[PDB]
Amino acid sequence: DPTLEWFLSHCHIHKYPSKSTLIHQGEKAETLYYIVKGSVAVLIKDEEGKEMILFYLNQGDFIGELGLFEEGQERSAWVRAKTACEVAEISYKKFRQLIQVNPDILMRLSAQMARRLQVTSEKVGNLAFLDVTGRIAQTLLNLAKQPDAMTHPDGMQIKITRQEIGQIVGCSRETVGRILKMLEDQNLISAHGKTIVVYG
């Protein structure tokens, strides 16, 4: 991918250990990132410091793009390393020059923005239309749809903690545990340690 190589040749790459915060909500935005290796969580917080996970981003994803198109923006969310990460960084002004040179790099970034808006909109609908059981169920389905989900003779299998499910749906880890027990009883799912099979 010559496009990617050319873009990256203009970035400076930095390593972030698991759990480190790459981006703090409210900081002034002047730089774009790209995940060469690793995975991160994008999250927001309520007034009680409870975190919610808006998105998981991985190798190939841009981050910190939302301040690119208007100056004086603040970072709209926190971004925290789930794994150890290699992350390329580049100033907004330099990136703008790259765009004038070859707009395919902006098309790639924008393609990701479009996907993120589609998925985030779906999350709005889930939060507004479903009760807690429905939200948890739909989250299990969505995770069953991820590339890293592994086939199972009963359905599709995923790994994730009660805590993480809770951070995605907006509930406590306890509530999540009770609801997963129910879905197991209704023979819709199966549970293990940190492994779940979704029947479908």
Ligand X SMILES: Nc1ncnc2c1ncn2[C@@H]1O[C@@H]2COP(=O)(O)O[C@H]2[C@H]1O
Contact residues toward ligand X (CB under 6 A) are 23, 29, 42, 54-55, 63-67, 75-77, 79, 116-117, 120-121
Residue span binding its own copies (CB under 8 A) among the ranges 122-130, 137-145, 175-183, 186-194: 122-130
Min CB(27)–its own copies separation in Å: 14
| Smallest gap from residue 13 Cβ to ligand X (A) | 18
Pick between residue 80 and residue 162 the one whose CB is nearest to ligand X: 80
Cα→Cα distances 82→7, 40, 53, 79, Å: 25, 5, 12, 9
- Distances 128 to 10, 50, 122, 135, 171 between C-alpha atoms, Å: 43, 19, 10, 10, 15
Task: Return phi, psi of residue 77, to 5°.
Answer: -155, 170
Shortest distance (Å) from residue 67 CB to its own copies: 8
Q: Under rule CB under 8 A, how many of the chain's residues touch its own copies?
A: 36
Q: Tokens 């990701």: give the residue.
A: 112
Q: String of b and e for 156-170 (b: at least 16 CB within 10 Å)?
A: bbbeeebebbbbbbe
Q: Which residues bind its own copies (CB under 8 A)?
A: 44, 46-47, 50, 52, 54, 65-70, 76-77, 99-100, 103, 106-107, 109-111, 113-114, 116-118, 120-121, 123-125, 127-129, 170
